[PDB]
Amino acid sequence: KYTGEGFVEKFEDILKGFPNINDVHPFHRDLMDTLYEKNHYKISLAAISRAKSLVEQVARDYVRLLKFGQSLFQCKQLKRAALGRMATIVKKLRDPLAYL
Amino acid sequence: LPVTVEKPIPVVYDLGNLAAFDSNVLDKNDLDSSNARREEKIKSLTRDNVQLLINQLLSLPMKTTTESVGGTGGQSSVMTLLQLPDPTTDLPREKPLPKAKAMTKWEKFAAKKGIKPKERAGKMIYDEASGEWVPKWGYKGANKKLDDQWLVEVIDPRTLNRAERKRLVKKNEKQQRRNMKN
Amino acid sequence: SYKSDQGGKRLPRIELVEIGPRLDFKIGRIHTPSPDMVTEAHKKPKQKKNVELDIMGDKLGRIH
Amino acid sequence: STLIPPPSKKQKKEAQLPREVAIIPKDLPNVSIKFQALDTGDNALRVPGAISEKQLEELLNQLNGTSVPYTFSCTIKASDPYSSLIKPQITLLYTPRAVFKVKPVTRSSSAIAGHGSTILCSAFAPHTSSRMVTGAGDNTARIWDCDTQTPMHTLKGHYNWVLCVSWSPDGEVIATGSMDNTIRLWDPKSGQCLGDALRGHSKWITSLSWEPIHLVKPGSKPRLASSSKDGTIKIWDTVSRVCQYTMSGHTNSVSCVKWGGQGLLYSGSHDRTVRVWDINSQGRCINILKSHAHWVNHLSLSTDYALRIGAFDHTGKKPSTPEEAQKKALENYEKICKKNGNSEEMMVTASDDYTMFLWNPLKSTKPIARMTGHQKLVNHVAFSPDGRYIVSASFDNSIKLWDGRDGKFISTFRGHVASVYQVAWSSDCRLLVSCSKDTTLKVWDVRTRKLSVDLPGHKDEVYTVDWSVDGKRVCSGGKDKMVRLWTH
Amino acid sequence: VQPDRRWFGNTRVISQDALQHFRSALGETQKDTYQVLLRRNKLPMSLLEEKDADESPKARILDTESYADAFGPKAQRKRPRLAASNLEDLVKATNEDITKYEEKQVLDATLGGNQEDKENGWTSAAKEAIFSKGQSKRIWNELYKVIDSSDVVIHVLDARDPLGTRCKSVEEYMKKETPHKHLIYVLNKCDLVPTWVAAAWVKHLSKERPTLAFHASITNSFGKGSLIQLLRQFSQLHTDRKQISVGFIGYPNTGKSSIINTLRKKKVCQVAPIPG
Amino acid sequence: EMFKVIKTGKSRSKSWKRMITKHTFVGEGFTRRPVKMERIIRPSALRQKKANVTHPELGVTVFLPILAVKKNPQSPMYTQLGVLTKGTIIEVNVSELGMVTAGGKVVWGKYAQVTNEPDRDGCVNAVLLV
RNA sequence: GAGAACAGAAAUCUCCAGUAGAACAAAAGGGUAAAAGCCCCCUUGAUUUUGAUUUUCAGUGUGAAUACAAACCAUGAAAGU
Numbered sequence A: 001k002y003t004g005e006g007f008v009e010k011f012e013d014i015l016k017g018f019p020n021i022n023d024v025h026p027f028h029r030d031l032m033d034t035l036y037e038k039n040h041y042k043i044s045l046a047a048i049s050r051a052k053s054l055v056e057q058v059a060r061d062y063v064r065l066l067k068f069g070q071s072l073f074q075c076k077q078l079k080r081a082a083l084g085r086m087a088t089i090v091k092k093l094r095d096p097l098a099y100l
Numbered sequence B: 001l002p003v004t005v006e007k008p009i010p011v012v013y014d015l016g017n018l019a020a021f022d023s024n025v026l027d028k029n030d031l032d033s034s035n036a037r038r039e040e041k042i043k044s045l046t047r048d049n050v051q052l053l054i055n056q057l058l059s060l061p062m063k064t065t066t067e068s069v070g071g072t073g074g075q076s077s078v079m080t081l082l083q084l085p086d087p088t089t090d091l092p093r094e095k096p097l098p099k100a101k102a103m104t105k106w107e108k109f110a111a112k113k114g115i116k117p118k119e120r121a122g123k124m125i126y127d128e129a130s131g132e133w134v135p136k137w138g139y140k141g142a143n144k145k146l147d148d149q150w151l152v153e154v155i156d157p158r159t160l161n162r163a164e165r166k167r168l169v170k171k172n173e174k175q176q177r178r179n180m181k182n
Numbered sequence C: 001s002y003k004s005d006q007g008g009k010r011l012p013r014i015e016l017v018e019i020g021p022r023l024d025f026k027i028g029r030i031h032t033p034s035p036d037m038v039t040e041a042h043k044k045p046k047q048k049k050n051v052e053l054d055i056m057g058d059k060l061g062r063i064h
Numbered sequence D: 001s002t003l004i005p006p007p008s009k010k011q012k013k014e015a016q017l018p019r020e021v022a023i024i025p026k027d028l029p030n031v032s033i034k035f036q037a038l039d040t041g042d043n044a045l046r047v048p049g050a051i052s053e054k055q056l057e058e059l060l061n062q063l064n065g066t067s068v069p070y071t072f073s074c075t076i077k078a079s080d081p082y083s084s085l086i087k088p089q090i091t092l093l094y095t096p097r098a099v100f101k102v103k104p105v106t107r108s109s110s111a112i113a114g115h116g117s118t119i120l121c122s123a124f125a126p127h128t129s130s131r132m133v134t135g136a137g138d139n140t141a142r143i144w145d146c147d148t149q150t151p152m153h154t155l156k157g158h159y160n161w162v163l164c165v166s167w168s169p170d171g172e173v174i175a176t177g178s179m180d181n182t183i184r185l186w187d188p189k190s191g192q193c194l195g196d197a198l199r200g201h202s203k204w205i206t207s208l209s210w211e212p213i214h215l216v217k218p219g220s221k222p223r224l225a226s227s228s229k230d231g232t233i234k235i236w237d238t239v240s241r242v243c244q245y246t247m248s249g250h251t252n253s254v255s256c257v258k259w260g261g262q263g264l265l266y267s268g269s270h271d272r273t274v275r276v277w278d279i280n281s282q283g284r285c286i287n288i289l290k291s292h293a294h295w296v297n298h299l300s301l302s303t304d305y306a307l308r309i310g311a312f313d314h315t316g317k318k319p320s321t322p323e324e325a326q327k328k329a330l331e332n333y334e335k336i337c338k339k340n341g342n343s344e345e346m347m348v349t350a351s352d353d354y355t356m357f358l359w360n361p362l363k364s365t366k367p368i369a370r371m372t373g374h375q376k377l378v379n380h381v382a383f384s385p386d387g388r389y390i391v392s393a394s395f396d397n398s399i400k401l402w403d404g405r406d407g408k409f410i411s412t413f414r415g416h417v418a419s420v421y422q423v424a425w426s427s428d429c430r431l432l433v434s435c436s437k438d439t440t441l442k443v444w445d446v447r448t449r450k451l452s453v454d455l456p457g458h459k460d461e462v463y464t465v466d467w468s469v470d471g472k473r474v475c476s477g478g479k480d481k482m483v484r485l486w487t488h
Numbered sequence E: 001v002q003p004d005r006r007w008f009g010n011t012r013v014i015s016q017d018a019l020q021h022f023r024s025a026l027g028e029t030q031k032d033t034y035q036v037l038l039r040r041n042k043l044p045m046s047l048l049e050e051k052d053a054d055e056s057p058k059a060r061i062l063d064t065e066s067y068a069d070a071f072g073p074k075a076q077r078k079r080p081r082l083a084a085s086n087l088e089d090l091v092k093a094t095n096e097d098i099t100k101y102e103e104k105q106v107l108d109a110t111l112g113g114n115q116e117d118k119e120n121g122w123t124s125a126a127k128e129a130i131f132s133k134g135q136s137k138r139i140w141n142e143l144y145k146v147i148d149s150s151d152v153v154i155h156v157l158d159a160r161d162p163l164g165t166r167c168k169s170v171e172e173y174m175k176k177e178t179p180h181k182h183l184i185y186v187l188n189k190c191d192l193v194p195t196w197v198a199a200a201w202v203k204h205l206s207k208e209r210p211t212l213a214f215h216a217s218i219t220n221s222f223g224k225g226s227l228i229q230l231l232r233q234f235s236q237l238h239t240d241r242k243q244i245s246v247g248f249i250g251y252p253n254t255g256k257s258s259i260i261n262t263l264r265k266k267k268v269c270q271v272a273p274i275p276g
Numbered sequence F: 001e002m003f004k005v006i007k008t009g010k011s012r013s014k015s016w017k018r019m020i021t022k023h024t025f026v027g028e029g030f031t032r033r034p035v036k037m038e039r040i041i042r043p044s045a046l047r048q049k050k051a052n053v054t055h056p057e058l059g060v061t062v063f064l065p066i067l068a069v070k071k072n073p074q075s076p077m078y079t080q081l082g083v084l085t086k087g088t089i090i091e092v093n094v095s096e097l098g099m100v101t102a103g104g105k106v107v108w109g110k111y112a113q114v115t116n117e118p119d120r121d122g123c124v125n126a127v128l129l130v
Numbered sequence G: 001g002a003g004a005a006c007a008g009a010a011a012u013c014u015c016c017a018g019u020a021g022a023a024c025a026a027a028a029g030g031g032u033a034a035a036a037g038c039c040c041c042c043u044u045g046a047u048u049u050u051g052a053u054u055u056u057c058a059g060u061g062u063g064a065a066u067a068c069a070a071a072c073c074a075u076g077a078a079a080g081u
């Protein structure tokens, strides 16, 4: 659980952060595309909400799976697997992060 | 060169057996034996019977597969064949219907105690020493391993193992007969 | 066959030829079966309400 | 296997009734009829009985006084060409036949052994279908005697993958594009390396096209167009075997190249951009096209099948003099050039933005139609051989069909399971072959929008299929190293 | 696990032309508000998909110009894409973008007050907790339990406002994940509406669901025996199944507890005028 | 193991019920049986319907749905029970790959044997038998 | 039956022939002959998949047997079997 919020709350600081180029003002809206590619802009941040929602999805499953664990060894292997599929998401996310 | 032929009586079709039934009046002296003008009276009726038959036959749906080379049990794609209905005229069946059913005295015992039938999976057991499979009967069977191996560990014993199966083989053969009686 | 052109693309004109063999039978007498045998020689091998298959299988259940 | 659900006990009784002789009895109502040529003309208002079309053809053929048989179409919403008269005045829509029938391919010949590598490309000679060259994953090329299904001149000399080949459309020379840099010209009869390899591209050969017959002077061999992955396009001589010029127009690799009809060149490249080039300005760019958002694959032209064959009909009868060949290729092009009395050849671009654009580059820079609908990228697009229908092949296991006039969607040849690799046409504009990533080939009637016959038989993927100009035989190439000739 | 020639088999193989027979067959599946699927006939359904879509979704713009080329210190990008055409065109196309912007400044100002309290420096109260209920972890753990438990679901609805009670949301899950299950509506509390009103509702509800009208009371009810006739058909159609459940879904305070009592003609469920 | 014995009763002293502790293919028309009738339990969370399936050749892993369970070792029961342990042979929808038989009658079903221990991770990973 | 040293009533080898007193899985009125006899060559079998009969306590879109049919499989150049 506690791992799952940390990815989310950082991303929620990002997705609240950037001023969401369209419907800002048509002066600023155009001017940022001339700097930042309104194509490349939106898709990056849209990837993060796609990235965020997977993490909550991964979190809720492995929480739900975990209550049927029977041993120490089984549950431990689920935790590493849980964070690894979180880690695979963030490793995937490399290029848009360096953009932002 | 005209095609469509009417008749006084609606001719019944049985397409399943490819049949045609004119029921009209058969004039006697047109069908006179010594009458020379006979074959036309035969043929003209017959080709008007046949012409009406194919018109129902060509009024049928048909199959068009799209298969090709090595069509093993089917038509070609250029073949287009007539979907037939069932033979409606009830012909005499040659042989009576074979219902040779019994409870076989095992199924009764399978009825009382609900022993479900097994999976019928395969012949191969797994052997230990060696690590091979070597199936159960049919070749190098797991049955006849005892008669072929080379020691005993306490009158021959191995022919006794042959004998006790010959009980149990013939016990199938004895239990074969009594269910053949009842 | 004859492409007869009034049946159009489909229907031909069928004009037979005798091939034979030209034959005439005279009836003699007849043995007949017993009616109990007739019933045996006419028997189906025998091999659902509110239940219908659609196209694609689809076992349906009618309510009424 | 899976099965069709059976007919019902109810349905078995339905078929037992005698039914439905199509008598067309008298058939005496009389409704008026209007004719209309499908290019421009509407011609008058007459009313016969309900008849067959062979009479209707001879009704129209006396109206002009032809002695030219036509195809008839009608009820156009929903496009449904007494045969129509049971569906309900009436406008008949007529169009020529180019009277010839090509029989659908069902079986094959044997599978042919040969080079021990994959097969990359193949092409028939236009003058006969017994000769057909193949491009291999081996360093060598192969010409086949298709009658005997035997090798004719195992063709050595390149030292990399022979990627794309072409036949000189008069029937003299074979180009062989190779994966290293090299192009060698070839003679079919001798099988000899005709001079030095044409060297000068710095990356591998992408596509090869010939300068068409009806433009080359009588007493001169046609030249060659060459497109390569370094973005360079070089117009070679065959005689002196020295190129005339490079063109440094496009930025990325050049995808495909075609020679135009009005002496033009067309170049799809990986710059998401198509350029229009002119020989008579000594190789100079005249129009640049900017529509696609992802890069362009396999452009084609309307009259290319005429431009490919070079003054042969389907019979493949050889012409005598080069001037007669100058007439005949001009003749055959003019029969497809001026449908509307107008030399307006059409171009369609294909790319990975799941989109095709319809182009009239001489008349304007604006695209006519934006073809749309695929899910995975399109790969292979070619006009109909009468220059009337445009087909589209793609990676979404589907083959869509388009108009050639306005870019209107027609239908989709669904039935392929893997990604469709390339298609090819029958000569009489009825059939349509296609190779896909799966093993089978599927042949499609354009007229009935349906699989004619699925044909399996290969062992693996299929990269190359091609149709014979006479409409007789079909060659096939794929990974499984065997050549398979397919025919009726 | 033994070795075997099968496993290396081909199992569930299609026939060819039946596909086009089935690609045809998706059109003519006309629904019945009097019929329910029972078995499904397992088919490779994804091969039978792909209706004629006509939009061709967007090209992947990351393929050409990725990120680092697009912007940054590296930024091999100088002119815009697609670098629109003409100046008077550019004068034009921005001028409505002027207007359309302030239109939503006029329009959303109707929606607020949500800015004035910020300058007033005061905030609104919290949500009361009783509006949450429920929306609870156990209370939906009830719900997926009984749905997975029951065979035929019925769904009650208030006759006063069935639209306020339709709660689609589950029917969604019904169609997609349990196709064999049933989901019939039930209109209870019909004695609170005028006579023709509930009559008009079922005509607007029979088009999709079978929808019995009903009034629940042990001693003076309505429409029991239509439902009793209705249920046993399901027990009839599920002949092999040896027995059959049915669970009663709905909003709170609708008569789910009540309806069972007037089926059993006695008090078996607990009932209350309070919701929960 | 693989059965957590569920004690029932107020005095939880009657137990007689078993819960399958491992991952499970269920079927499609499952619909949980009456509780007084049930003895064995396959709870909802441990119900896998779509496997993550690789191919030995061609290097592709495709997320495929699961059709049936033919051969599970370490019982004849669990075949009927649909118990997904390591080593089980399952039946997979192969609609997306597009295998074609000689005959052109494309195959949408193959036996794939699982690889992982899907207790010890949530996903099922399975190799197509070729 | 006529032949070939050891070699004889019986060892193998040639020619004539047996409508076959070929061995025929059967037992037979009858017939197989370029065989259903003899020899050689190539190979699984207890495969999968759903409508009829059953049995089930997780009634378990079948879970299996069983009945049927279809796909396949074996061989043959093929017809086919």
Ligand SMILES: Nc1nc2c(ncn2[C@@H]2O[C@H](COP(=O)(O)OP(=O)(O)OP(=O)(O)O)[C@@H](O)[C@H]2O)c(=O)[nH]1
Pocket: E188, E189, E190, E191, E192, E214, E215, E216, E217, E251, E252, E253, E254, E255, E256, E257, E258, E259, E270, E271, E272, E273, E274, E275, E276
């Ligand atoms: N007018 C009218 N009122 C009804 C009828 N049936 C139930 N009610 C009223 O609806 C209230 C709700 O009954 P319940 O059975 O407790 O409703 P419920 O939704 O099943 O109760 P919960 O399931 O616990 O939320 C009862 O107090 C009744 O007064 C009906 O048929 N007509």
Ligand SMILES: [Mg+2]
Pocket: E251, E252, E253, E254, E255, E256, E274, E275, E276
């Ligand atoms: Mg209530």
